[PDB]
Write a protein that binds this ligand. Structure first.
Ligand SMILES: [Zn+2]
Length: 35
Protein backbone atom coordinates (compact mmCIF):
# COMPACT_ATOMS: atom_id res chain seq x y z
CA UNK A 1 0.00 0.00 0.00
CA UNK A 2 0.95 3.64 0.36
CA UNK A 3 3.68 3.55 3.00
CA UNK A 4 5.55 6.65 1.90
CA UNK A 5 4.27 8.86 4.68
CA UNK A 6 6.99 8.00 7.17
CA UNK A 7 8.61 10.13 9.91
CA UNK A 8 12.00 8.74 9.00
CA UNK A 9 11.68 10.14 5.51
CA UNK A 10 14.88 10.32 3.50
CA UNK A 11 15.30 13.92 2.37
CA UNK A 12 16.94 12.99 -0.93
CA UNK A 13 14.88 14.46 -3.83
CA UNK A 14 15.82 12.02 -6.59
CA UNK A 15 15.65 9.18 -4.08
CA UNK A 16 12.41 9.98 -2.19
CA UNK A 17 12.75 7.24 0.39
CA UNK A 18 10.85 6.88 3.65
CA UNK A 19 11.74 4.65 6.59
CA UNK A 20 10.44 3.23 9.82
CA UNK A 21 13.87 2.03 10.94
CA UNK A 22 16.19 4.65 12.42
CA UNK A 23 19.13 2.27 12.11
CA UNK A 24 18.32 1.68 8.50
CA UNK A 25 17.65 5.20 7.31
CA UNK A 26 20.75 6.32 9.20
CA UNK A 27 23.04 4.13 7.07
CA UNK A 28 20.86 4.87 4.04
CA UNK A 29 21.58 8.53 4.68
CA UNK A 30 25.25 8.06 5.53
CA UNK A 31 25.82 6.30 2.20
CA UNK A 32 23.93 9.14 0.51
CA UNK A 33 26.59 11.66 1.47
CA UNK A 34 29.18 8.95 0.81
CA UNK A 35 30.46 8.61 4.36
ZN1 LIG B 1 17.45 8.10 0.10
Amino acid sequence: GSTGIKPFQCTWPDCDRSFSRSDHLALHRKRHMLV
